[PDB]
Amino acid sequence: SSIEKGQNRVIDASLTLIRERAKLKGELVRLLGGAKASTSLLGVPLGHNSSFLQGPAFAPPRIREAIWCGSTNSATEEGKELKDPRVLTDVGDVPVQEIRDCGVDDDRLMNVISESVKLVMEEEPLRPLVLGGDHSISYPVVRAVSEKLGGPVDILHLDAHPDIYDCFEGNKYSHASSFARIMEGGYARRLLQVGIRSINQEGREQGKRFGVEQYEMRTFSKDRPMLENLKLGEGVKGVYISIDVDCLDPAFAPGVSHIEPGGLSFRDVLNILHNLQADVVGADVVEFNPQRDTVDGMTAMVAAKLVRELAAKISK
Amino acid sequence: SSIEKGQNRVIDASLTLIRERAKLKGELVRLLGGAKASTSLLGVPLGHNSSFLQGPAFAPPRIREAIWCGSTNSATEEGKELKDPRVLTDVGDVPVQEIRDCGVDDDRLMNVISESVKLVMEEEPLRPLVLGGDHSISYPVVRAVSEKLGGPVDILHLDAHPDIYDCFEGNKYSHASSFARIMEGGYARRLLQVGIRSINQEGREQGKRFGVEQYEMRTFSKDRPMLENLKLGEGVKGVYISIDVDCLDPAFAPGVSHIEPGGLSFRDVLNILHNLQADVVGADVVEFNPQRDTVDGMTAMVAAKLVRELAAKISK
Amino acid sequence: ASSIEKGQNRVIDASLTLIRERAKLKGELVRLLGGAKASTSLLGVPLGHNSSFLQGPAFAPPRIREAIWCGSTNSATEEGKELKDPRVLTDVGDVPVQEIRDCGVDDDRLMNVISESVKLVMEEEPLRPLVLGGDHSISYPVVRAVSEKLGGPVDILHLDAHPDIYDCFEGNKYSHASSFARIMEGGYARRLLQVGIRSINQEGREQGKRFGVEQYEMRTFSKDRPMLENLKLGEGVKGVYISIDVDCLDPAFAPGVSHIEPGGLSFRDVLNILHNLQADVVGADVVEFNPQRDTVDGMTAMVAAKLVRELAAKISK
Amino acid sequence: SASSIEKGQNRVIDASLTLIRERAKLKGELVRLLGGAKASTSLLGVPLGHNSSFLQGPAFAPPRIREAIWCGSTNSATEEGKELKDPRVLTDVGDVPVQEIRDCGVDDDRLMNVISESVKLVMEEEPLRPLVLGGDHSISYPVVRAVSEKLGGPVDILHLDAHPDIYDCFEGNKYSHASSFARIMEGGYARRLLQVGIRSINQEGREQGKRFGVEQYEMRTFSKDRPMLENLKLGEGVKGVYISIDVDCLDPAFAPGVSHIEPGGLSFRDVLNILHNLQADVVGADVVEFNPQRDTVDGMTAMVAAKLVRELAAKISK
Amino acid sequence: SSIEKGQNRVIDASLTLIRERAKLKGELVRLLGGAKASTSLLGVPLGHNSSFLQGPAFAPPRIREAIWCGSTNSATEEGKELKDPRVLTDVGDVPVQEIRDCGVDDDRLMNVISESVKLVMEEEPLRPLVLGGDHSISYPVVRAVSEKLGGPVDILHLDAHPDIYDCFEGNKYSHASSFARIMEGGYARRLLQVGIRSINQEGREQGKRFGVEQYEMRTFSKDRPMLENLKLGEGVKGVYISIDVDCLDPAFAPGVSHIEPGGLSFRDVLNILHNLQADVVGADVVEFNPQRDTVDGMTAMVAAKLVRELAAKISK
Amino acid sequence: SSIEKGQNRVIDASLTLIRERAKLKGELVRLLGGAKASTSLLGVPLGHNSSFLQGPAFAPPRIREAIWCGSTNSATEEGKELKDPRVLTDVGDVPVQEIRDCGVDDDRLMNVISESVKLVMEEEPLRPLVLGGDHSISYPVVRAVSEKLGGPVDILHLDAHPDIYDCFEGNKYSHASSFARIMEGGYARRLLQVGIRSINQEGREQGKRFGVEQYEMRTFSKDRPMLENLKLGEGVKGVYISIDVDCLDPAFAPGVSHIEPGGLSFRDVLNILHNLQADVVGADVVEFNPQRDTVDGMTAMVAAKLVRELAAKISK
Ligand SMILES: NCCC[C@H](N)C(=O)O
Ligand SMILES: NCCC[C@H](N)C(=O)O
Ligand SMILES: NCCC[C@H](N)C(=O)O
Ligand SMILES: NCCC[C@H](N)C(=O)O
Ligand SMILES: [Mn+2]
Ligand SMILES: [Mn+2]
Ligand SMILES: [Mn+2]
Ligand SMILES: [Mn+2]
Ligand SMILES: [Mn+2]
Ligand SMILES: [Mn+2]
Ligand SMILES: [Mn+2]
Ligand SMILES: [Mn+2]
Ligand SMILES: [Mn+2]
Ligand SMILES: [Mn+2]
Ligand SMILES: [Mn+2]
Ligand SMILES: [Mn+2]
Ligand code: NA
Ligand code: NA
Ligand code: NA
Ligand code: NA
Ligand code: NA
Ligand code: NA
């Protein structure tokens, strides 16, 4: 009624905001010349699919402040210039809270996040890097990348958790279920999960069902050489990388909802990302919880540096 | 100039979104009936006019979380029910960071902010409670309130500092120059400044020159009775309440950019607000810096409860 | 079968026997020194599971004891009593609440154990119980136990941001938000003065009006302060019980709470009320200190400890 | 007089042991009624910190550990796949009421004897095996003594710690947390003592290791020693293996909530590489020296302590 | 024993260092003059007479950083300019840890503290404001001011504690015996102890024995009107103010070694200082413990603003 | 002009204080007999050459406290006894803030630091270990060591940053330029920078210009065997080791002005220091920022243990 049409006008004005801002970043990259791919940040400030704490809703603006901190320089480790738009642009945040606040259901909210990602991909040669937000957001992002490209992607999923519960606590959009949604829908072929150390019988059974390659930290000593020399995406249209910050031991990343000892070092993660051979078509950095971070924002710098090194990898 | 016209498509859509949200809230309040005035939150995540720290840019979403925290109930001290839209609605945040990012200068930003305030006012019978954001925003909110209403207002300005510097560090939009801009444009008649304990010889000269009633904490013992029995707005369009969070002793409100000992207690602030007779037309809660808050968000709960009590006074 | 309830009973009985043996030694110490009319004895009830928001008060009583004896402090109360005199303060320790919960004991029988533990202290004359919470749910079994033992209602001074008189908060009758409904329902309290109230809803006020509760809100503290720094309670009944939720204090003074509620009393405001109260105090509690929410140096532990020290000087005589 | 004092204390001690015995009896009956278990980890808390040389914070640890084991952020499966809500995998007989026993004047010899008897009460309920939550490292002595006396012979011990804890009498306290492994080696309770993660030791510690034939692995040789330490075999021919983990075996990056910050320690993953690969019939274990008052505001060291307890439980239970 | 020539030239070089900087500060003040009194800061970074924590050793450099923090203005509540050397100069810190390390005894160390205070006074028109350090430093500072002026002073002593034990734990220089030492020496006519709330039998007896006026917080309701209208020094050499930061409720000043609930507000102390009628000849601000302070240095700001307000009272 | 006269009397007393203390330590070392080399701590509390925060100004006293903490023992990892003066003495802190305050320029302040180092070196057989302070101090320290020994040294520089900017933000004494100053003076033959992970085009170009061996964390897997087997100083005057605490991953060393994820573990650094073959003639531990440390001083312990293990290596 009056309501459904009111909701459509807020949704439409939200998509228009992303569309106009993408257009300006696309024109800016196309004007400078030569880029084959150019990382564009899209923020999805959503936390209500979280099982424990909703703090990731507040992450994307903290991440951006950390990327540009006066304490850092603008060069990535392998020497890309983050001030160059062909390396990194930013189309801003999906207005999630404003959409929820007007009574929009999750089916439609997640549809708006997909469309938001399509708006970036439709500006050549931008490729999306999504700032979460809780891990529920990887389903509408991966769906949007798969649909746009016209086939399943191979995924590298860095996570303490496999996020492959059929329906965690009745919520099909649970942050603990988004890789079940992705695999059910035929949006991914290979799913490599690395850093896994919190998994139950359902996680293992769902892993076998979907053909997932689950690397547990209890075999990391033996798996490290293979994980520091990954080659992904041959025979599919691209590779997507999803990083839950909780792939890192809490010593490196305390600013997470799920503290799970025995994880990767920051340098372990960069060894995997730097050495990965892959046509990276998209990526996300999720589950940064600023409310659980240190008083000085150490996990914000962790999330920012992951974003920066993913941008170097995506942009070419 | 393809970008200069493109800036306008970002602004148009930015304001479109505020209006589309404003109408839905408008409609729900008019459906319910009986409201003369209805507090509607409008966030202004702007901190780049700050002299020391830009942390208030992150405040409005934290304030909103604290209002609805499971630890609290939805009753105000007086007994007003915050779940009733006649009492409180929220039109969300102005996308200041997106606007800044598409290269728009401060003139047009502050005008977009003024226009956004006007969009809420044009939806009867909503009255704007702006969540700052640094002090800089009061000037465009007040100008927009003063323009819409057709003439000057009187201001209750609760703050440790007086913020009437002519031009502070060469920025005319400085959070320290905001009330100099307001007085200069005759948007205010009586400016009552309360909780003042950080003032310089320029602060006093400008206060006399604009005929400002500056109450210093030095005389609070004698002043309390007068301060706890205030009446304002007779002969004017209305009364604007600008509450900088540092009016409170840092013991109550650590989460600010300027720690200034010898402040008000939270109860002192409620004594003043509960007792003040005013036609309140507009109110801001500013300078709340989450990056300076306690790990448990004590200042977020302070900001939230001042918003709640301010909304129980504005709503009628 | 009923092998379950009987096994639970053996654990409950052993739990109560341990409080009995501890209370006896403290009793015998106070009697052997001689001259006490009343001797504050601490009983901890490390219980958090009736909270609506955070269960951290389950951990408070050990932290409060540490703060009472911190080497940064001396052993004198403000009005000059010696806390090292067992006649002024003793400690019978903690009800083993978690271990009773862990063997499947329901809340009715668990609250019965708390009551029975309070009686066991009262039955070593001249001990009077000062209970360390724990969440505010515990005041119900404590006040029930004191009233039943003294054989009549008491007057209660209740210092709290919240009135805690929901008929059944979230369906739990033992909710920390319902303990003073449970108390007034049972006729264990004649007068109930609630002081520091600044978070209350229509049901709060309707339940206030129903049970004859005197609700002093902070929006009228300027006016009410003279009368509140001059209380007299308990005349014509068995005595006065003082319940202090640490959230009566503004969070500036007491951040270590589950419910941050700006606009509360100063610590000095609470000692003015306590010091000047005229009352034969038969029991007290300090509840809702949440160590998990405290500063890293334990400021709220020192607050809860000093409230305990000033209540002990008041109860001991 | 002053001998009647000892009789009142004995009433508190007996009431304390009776309470542990009754809790242990329900846990043993539950495990046995479910059937099939050969061994079932049962937690025993010993909230003792007064033998500490710097901070007594470990007295507050056991309840914080239990909370973290059941934290709603976590799931109930161990890394290897054991279900912690199965009583045959984990039960909990609660805490020894240490503070109350100290508070009625009981001397340290009698208090440590209570800790020993409490451990035996768990072991007496077949098939429970004790996993002790400290508490400072002093408690390892009475625990290891009870396990050895009850099994009727020596155990091999894996001791994970920044410190060897083998001073004869640290600051005149024979029950010092820095002397508990001297107490253990003097009593004949151990065949092998392997000390892993050592990085704070002096000549007295090295001399005491030689005197008792302790095998001391220092972090300065961890590059060389790692393969050996990640393939340990212990307890063949004796009553089994006891594992004592001082949380300060971990670099303080991983475990800040300790009284003794000693940079250059093991990663959490390094410790699980050692535990997971250890071949051992583990007859008991402890997790000690978690200091909640030195932890982060979010309890990161509580979650470290809890995950060590959970992984040990998965190893003890079978 | 060539340690004597060393100990001696270490001491001489320490004293030289203060003489030289006093000479420069004096010259700068008279250079453009018309000042009767000018406040000069002297740090005594001494904490080893503390009974619990020694953290006050580190305070004086932290107080200086807070006085000149970019978040603050250079004007005092009354309106004096701290950049004006006539109002405030700074002669740096007595090298206490350096004198300690060469094996010098507490008797001689405290003499150095005394000598160092006289160096500031010997340089007209400088008046010493000492940044502690623990409360032991007040004995030698008051000794120096009294001997230099040749007569006793009236002393306003703000503290949770009376610091008047005969020999706390066997140390006659205990921070808990400074006022026993002062009273035994005849340096004070009147001693007013304000904010007392941790006192035992020995505290009351020593008080009665020395004629000390002990204001306990439990009578502050009745004493406030009187404490906010003091008059001291009339007839004797002048007024010394000693301020233990723990005079303030820990809500206002958590950065102390002794947390003692139920203290004064920051505005309470300012009401006492602003209305104190007195010729103030010296003052100290002691027992700030930076190791117990909040992460953002609230108590540092609290000690700095006491120093700034004291300097506005002392300078003229 | 008598200002200039004043400054020289202050510098002289400042040097006179280091001379006399170093005399007492040399005499003590010489009287115990047998030492070839004896580590002597010299503190340089200087932060104003920092680009981001001046916290390291406060570091040296907090390091000393950590070295002697009652939670620790006095043996190093390889068994040296820190209470033996032949293993460790301390000549205390260059009075940096007193020299700045009397208006001395950075040229002369840096020369004072050089002179303070030589005063240690002139007391046989002390060798200097300097506690920073920000990285700017390495230049005047190495310049003094090289001038004193009459030739160049090899340097091991442990840092996240190369600090080799020509003129970072206009300041030739920038903490980000001190190795450009060192390499321009010919004070060093080899400069091995280890743990580098924040470097731009200028850092790389300047590295090539001065022949710097730049070991980046992105090749640490490959490089680790060679870095745990270093031999330096053969055919030159010896080896100087500079340790920026931010060489460590912020997981281990959060108390730094520059959070840079993906660094060395503590054990990594000790594997390098313990296996290094070198005649170490001097060392520094710089850029510990206590205002960014944990509430319990974790980074203070890290800095203390680096100092302790360097002392074991320097003393012989
Ligand atoms: N994304 C994190 C989900 C955590 C959940 N407790 C699990 O079992 O994984
Ligand atoms: N709004 C804050 C203004 C602070 C400024 N340093 C001043 O001197 O006023
Ligand atoms: N300066 C503080 C002294 C504190 C001591 N516990 C006392 O009894 O006063
Ligand atoms: N377990 C901690 C003991 C620490 C002691 N300072 C030692 O030297 O071992
Ligand atoms: Mn996930
Ligand atoms: Mn995860
Ligand atoms: Mn302002
Ligand atoms: Mn302000
Ligand atoms: Mn309550
Ligand atoms: Mn309450
Ligand atoms: Mn140990
Ligand atoms: Mn240890
Ligand atoms: Mn004092
Ligand atoms: Mn004091
Ligand atoms: Mn550096
Ligand atoms: Mn660096
Ligand atoms: Na989450
Ligand atoms: Na600001
Ligand atoms: Na609670
Ligand atoms: Na300990
Ligand atoms: Na002290
Ligand atoms: Na720095």
Residue numbers in the entry:
A (entry chain F), B (entry chain C), E (entry chain A), F (entry chain D): 27 to 342
C (entry chain B): 26 to 342
D (entry chain E): 25 to 342
Q: Which lines from the publication concern this structure?
A:
In this route, ornithine is obtained from arginine by the action of arginase (arginine amidinohydrolase, ARGAH). Similarly to other eukaryotic (Di Costanzo et al., 2010) and prokaryotic (Bewley et al., 1999) orthologues, plant ARGAHs, are binuclear manganese metalloenzymes. Together with agmatinase, formiminoglutamase, and proclavaminate aminohydrolase, ARGAHs are grouped with the Ureohydrolase Superfamily.
In this work, ARGAHs from two model plant species, A. thaliana (AtARGAH1) and Medicago truncatula (MtARGAH), are structurally characterized by X-ray crystallography and small-angle X-ray scattering (SAXS). Based on the crystal structures of AtARGAH1 and MtARGAH complexes with ornithine combined with the analysis of sequence conservation of the key residues of plant ARGAHs their dual arginase/agmatinase function in plants is discussed. A. thaliana has two ARGAH isoforms encoded by genes ARGAH1 (At4g08900) and ARGAH2 (At4g08870), which most likely appeared by gene duplication (Brownfield et al., 2008). Arabidopsis ARGAHs present dual localization; they are localized in the mitochondrial matrix (Flores et al., 2008), but they can also be targeted to plastids (Patel et al., 2017). Only ARGAH1 is actively transcribed in pollen (Brownfield et al., 2008), which likely secures the high demand of proline in pollen. The studies on ARGAH from Arabidopsis thaliana and soybean have also shown that concerted action of ARGAH and one of the arginine decarboxylases may complement the putrescine biosynthesis as the third route (Patel et al., 2017). Therefore, arginine is initially decarboxylated to agmatine and then, through the hydrolytic action of ARGAH on agmatine (agmatinase activity), putrescine is produced.
